[PDB]
Amino acid sequence: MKPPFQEALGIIQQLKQHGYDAYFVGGAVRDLLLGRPIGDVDIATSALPEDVMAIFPKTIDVGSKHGTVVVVHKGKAYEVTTFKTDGSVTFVRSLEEDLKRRDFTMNAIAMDEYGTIIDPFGGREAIRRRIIRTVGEAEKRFREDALRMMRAVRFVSELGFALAPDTEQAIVQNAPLLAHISVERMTMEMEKLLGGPFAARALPLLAETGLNAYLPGLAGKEKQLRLAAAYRWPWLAAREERWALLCHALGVQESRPFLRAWKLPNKVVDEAGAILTALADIPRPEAWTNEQLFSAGLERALSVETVRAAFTGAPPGPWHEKLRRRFASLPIKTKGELAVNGKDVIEWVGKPAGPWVKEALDAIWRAVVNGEVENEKERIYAWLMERNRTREKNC
Amino acid sequence: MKPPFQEALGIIQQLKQHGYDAYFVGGAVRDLLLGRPIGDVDIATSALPEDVMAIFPKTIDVGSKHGTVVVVHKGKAYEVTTFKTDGSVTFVRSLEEDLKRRDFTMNAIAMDEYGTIIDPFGGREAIRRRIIRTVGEAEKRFREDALRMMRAVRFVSELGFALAPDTEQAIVQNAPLLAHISVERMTMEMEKLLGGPFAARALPLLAETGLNAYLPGLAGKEKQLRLAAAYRWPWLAAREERWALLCHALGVQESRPFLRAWKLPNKVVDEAGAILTALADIPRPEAWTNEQLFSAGLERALSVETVRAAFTGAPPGPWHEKLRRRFASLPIKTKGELAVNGKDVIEWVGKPAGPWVKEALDAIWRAVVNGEVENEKERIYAWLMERNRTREKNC
Numbered sequence: 001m002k003p004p005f006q007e008a009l010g011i012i013q014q015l016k017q018h019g020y021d022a023y024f025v026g027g028a029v030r031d032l033l034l035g036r037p038i039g040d041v042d043i044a045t046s047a048l049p050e051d052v053m054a055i056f057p058k059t060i061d062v063g064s065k066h067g068t069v070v071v072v073h074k075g076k077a078y079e080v081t082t083f084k085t086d087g088s089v090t091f092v093r094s095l096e097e098d099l100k101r102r103d104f105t106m107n108a109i110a111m112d113e114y115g116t117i118i119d120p121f122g123g124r125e126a127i128r129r130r131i132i133r134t135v136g137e138a139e140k141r142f143r144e145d146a147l148r149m150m151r152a153v154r155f156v157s158e159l160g161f162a163l164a165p166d167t168e169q170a171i172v173q174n175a176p177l178l179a180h181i182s183v184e185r186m187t188m189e190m191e192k193l194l195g196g197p198f199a200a201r202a203l204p205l206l207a208e209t210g211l212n213a214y215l216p217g218l219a220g221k222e223k224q225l226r227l228a229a230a231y232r233w234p235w236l237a238a239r240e241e242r243w244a245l246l247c248h249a250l251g252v253q254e255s256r257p258f259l260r261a262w263k264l265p266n267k268v269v270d271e272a273g274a275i276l277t278a279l280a281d282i283p284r285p286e287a288w289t290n291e292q293l294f295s296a297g298l299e300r301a302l303s304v305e306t307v308r309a310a311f312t313g314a315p316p317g318p319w320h321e322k323l324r325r326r327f328a329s330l331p332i333k334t335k336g337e338l339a340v341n342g343k344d345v346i347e348w349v350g351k352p353a354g355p356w357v358k359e360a361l362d363a364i365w366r367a368v369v370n371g372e373v374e375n376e377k378e379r380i381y382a383w384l385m386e387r388n389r390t391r392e393k394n395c
Numbered sequence: 396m397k398p399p400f401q402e403a404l405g406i407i408q409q410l411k412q413h414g415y416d417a418y419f420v421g422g423a424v425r426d427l428l429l430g431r432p433i434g435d436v437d438i439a440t441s442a443l444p445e446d447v448m449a450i451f452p453k454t455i456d457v458g459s460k461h462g463t464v465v466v467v468h469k470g471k472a473y474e475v476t477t478f479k480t481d482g483s484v485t486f487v488r489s490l491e492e493d494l495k496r497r498d499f500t501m502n503a504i505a506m507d508e509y510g511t512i513i514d515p516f517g518g519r520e521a522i523r524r525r526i527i528r529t530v531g532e533a534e535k536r537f538r539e540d541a542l543r544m545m546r547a548v549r550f551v552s553e554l555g556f557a558l559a560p561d562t563e564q565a566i567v568q569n570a571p572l573l574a575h576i577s578v579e580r581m582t583m584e585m586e587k588l589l590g591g592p593f594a595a596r597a598l599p600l601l602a603e604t605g606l607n608a609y610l611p612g613l614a615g616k617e618k619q620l621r622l623a624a625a626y627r628w629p630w631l632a633a634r635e636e637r638w639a640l641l642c643h644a645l646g647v648q649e650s651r652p653f654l655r656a657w658k659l660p661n662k663v664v665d666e667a668g669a670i671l672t673a674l675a676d677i678p679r680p681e682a683w684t685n686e687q688l689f690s691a692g693l694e695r696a697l698s699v700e701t702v703r704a705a706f707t708g709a710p711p712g713p714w715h716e717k718l719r720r721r722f723a724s725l726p727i728k729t730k731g732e733l734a735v736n737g738k739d740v741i742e743w744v745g746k747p748a749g750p751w752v753k754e755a756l757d758a759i760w761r762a763v764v765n766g767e768v769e770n771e772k773e774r775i776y777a778w779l780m781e782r783n784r785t786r787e788k789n790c
């Protein structure tokens with residue numbers, strides 16, 4: 001018994017004692033078998049949501065309308081699912097009926113409270129061979145939930161399996177069915193695919209399969225995707241950095257309309273382009289400017305070089321480290337640090353409050369930062385004063 | 396800082412550091428103030444669901460569509476809710492806007508990471524006085540969510556507060572609006588109200604208010620409800636035992652159609668009647684019969700006397716203890732224990748398999764139980780054999 005399932009063993013036990021019968025199901029079994037780090041432990045039972053909400057103290061009702069209940073056990077969250085037949089939903093007592101409904105074979109395994117692998121679908125084979133195959137006709141299943149395709153391809157990104165000949169085919173043939181699946185749902189899938197350790201050949205595949213030109217803004221970029229192979233994807237740390245390079249390697253013009261089609265939250269689509277930009281503007285890592293760094297702010301700066309990295313081949317290590325230095329020597333690091341107040345500039349140049357004031361301070365920080373004038377009140381005063389009679393001699 | 400919030404303090408802290416601002420909200424504050432045992436710790440913040448899913452590792456998405464996110468922290472489950480205005484939902488930054496939307500004042504409190512109570516609605520007053528008052532016009536709020544009434548009455552059950560004159564009034568005037576709220580939702584509320592420590596005057600109130608005759612099967616039972624006052628509700632330990640007595644004191648004829656209207660699960664409505672029945676059939680605690688006990692099975696037996704208790708005044712203590720003895724002396728306690736097999740009765744009376752067989756075994760347990768014949772094979776054989784030539788001499 002692996003500690004993953006060890007603590008999770010209770011869930012089963014209590015479900016068995018109340019005469020219910022339960023199994024470990026899903027990837028957790030796969031990962032265990034495959035020999036991956038074990039993800040979410042998932043548990044499937046013949047006990048109805050209501051029976052599970054009676055047995056366990058903490059019970060979160062996520063969607064008792066389609067089988068699942070989240071059971072807080074011993075300080076974790078496990079997803080217990082009453083066996084079902086994907087028709088509304090129909091609940092059975094046949095575990096075999098349940099496995100029978102899942103996307104692919106690697107997923108359709110189950111292990112008993114004792115540790116005996118229950119594989120009525122050749123999951124065990126699939127894994128040794130490392131192949132994503134459909135549970136039943138690949139055709140019928142994609143008709144049963146089109147999204148099942150995207151993920152067949154994400155799995156390729158996430159595990160590094162190959163697709164099954166008849167399964168892959170089925171995708172190109174049934175490609176259209178995607179436009180029927182909500183964008184929201186497509187995005188989360190794209191966003192895991194992207195973080196694959198095999199992303200590199202997931203994306204291309206996304207193309208060789210019919211799947212391209214049904215996903216947001218991925219019309220006819222076939223060439224771009226296949227090429228995407230050389231990108232060091234897996235050193236991208238973050239979602240932004242992800243979307244970031246994804247754009248770049250598509251060559252995507254305006255990041256904003258694109259990432260928005262993907263129904264991504266603003267804060268990403270904003271910081272997305274943020275970096276996409278700083279990247280175009282700075283073509284070289286040595287070229288970062290005390291101004292520019294201050295402007296983008298450490299975190300983003302680094303993320304820039306890490307995207308750059310994923311494009312170049314050049315390890316970001318040293319740059320990250322040079323930026324981290326520079327940024328902690330920038331005589332200020334935010335605008336709020338500026339020893340001098342917007343009101344100070346008014347009482348100083350004897351003008352009414354207005355538009356000029358911004359431009360003033362605008363050019364004061366760019367002075368403090370580039371080390372031109374200190375960040376003390378007195379000196380910035382003279383600095384301002386003495387640069388205003390300069391703007392009289394010049395015109 | 397009370398331990399409840401102590402561990403929960405982290406949730407706030409990390410939401411503050413990422414510049415977000417959060418508060419403890421809800422009954423947890425009420426309970427703390429009131430000086431009750433502290434229930435669910437709840438947290439409200441300006442950070443959107445997505446921001447909360449980014450910051451914390453474990454993040455359960457219960458309904459990010461209306462603000463709430465369940466954040467698993469340090470081994471518990473806390474509900475973080477992005478401030479909102481109950482219009483679809485609109486998210487703000489104003490905590491004051493958030494409090495302003497909640498049902499009643501006791502609930503509309505908030506405490507900061509430091510321990511400073513934030514009461515912009517006189518919750519603190521309401522609690523000292525022990526009064527359930529509406530946050531704003533009692534009228535408008537019941538139009539905003541009719542169910543708010545049921546609970547204004549359950550709260551009476553739960554805490555032992557009185558209703559505010561203008562609030563109580565508003566209920567009778569706006570009584571009708573209930574039929575618009577899903578039964579499912581009414582039941583859960585009734586199911587808490589019933590377990591109230593003040594249940595006794597909650598039920599009556601449920602009547603003096605317009606609330607009666609909008610709840611399942613509670614048409615015109617006004618008299619029955621008011622009388623319901625004398626029942627020792629609070630010693631009812633279980634759901635069944637609850638519905639059980641509720642039926643009884645309403646005098647409800649057929650339990651089955653009634654409890655079912657409440658959209659209660661079967662296993663309850665079944666065990667519900669179960670007891671309701673055993674109760675009508677056995678009018679006296681001394682009258683339990685080795686048969687009857689074996690038949691209902693300890694647990695339910697006790698439950699029966701516990702309901703009887705809630706009706707009589709007589710403490711179940713002794714009976715429960717007498718039952719628990721008798722039942723562990725019953726020479727068998729289930730039907731599966733019977734040393735004699737249905738197949739044994741066939742190969743013994745030389746008849747084909749059929750309906751008589753049940754009737755045979757049926758009268759064998761009742762013979763093993765009442766201590767008439769042993770629960771060994773040999774002796775039951777004889778016992779059966781010698782009672783079949785008895786049924787020849789008799790007719």
Ligand SMILES: Nc1ccn([C@@H]2O[C@H](COP(=O)(O)OP(=O)(O)OP(=O)(O)O)[C@@H](O)[C@H]2O)c(=O)n1
Nearest residue numbers: 025026027028039101102103104107145147148
């Ligand atoms: N379109 C989908 C998506 C998922 N599943 C099923 O839902 C379970 C859990 O879903 P998921 O979160 O995707 O976990 P796994 O598919 O098991 O793999 P992973 O945990 O890496 O996502 C799986 O066992 C799978 O059979 C499905 O039948 N159809």
Ligand SMILES: Nc1ccn([C@@H]2O[C@H](COP(=O)(O)OP(=O)(O)OP(=O)(O)O)[C@@H](O)[C@H]2O)c(=O)n1
Nearest residue numbers: 420421422423434496497498499502540542543
């Ligand atoms: N119809 C409802 C039901 C609940 N609430 C709000 O949702 C929050 C949590 O709901 P609940 O689980 O009922 O907790 P409390 O009302 O605070 O009290 P208790 O924990 O005893 O149920 C509360 O702060 C309350 O203001 C609401 O505004 N309208």
Ligand SMILES: [Mg+2]
Nearest residue numbers: 040041077078
């Ligand atoms: Mg888990």
Ligand SMILES: [Mg+2]
Nearest residue numbers: 026027040042
């Ligand atoms: Mg999973």
Ligand SMILES: [Mg+2]
Nearest residue numbers: 435436472473
């Ligand atoms: Mg809790």
Ligand SMILES: [Mg+2]
Nearest residue numbers: 421422435437
């Ligand atoms: Mg609560």
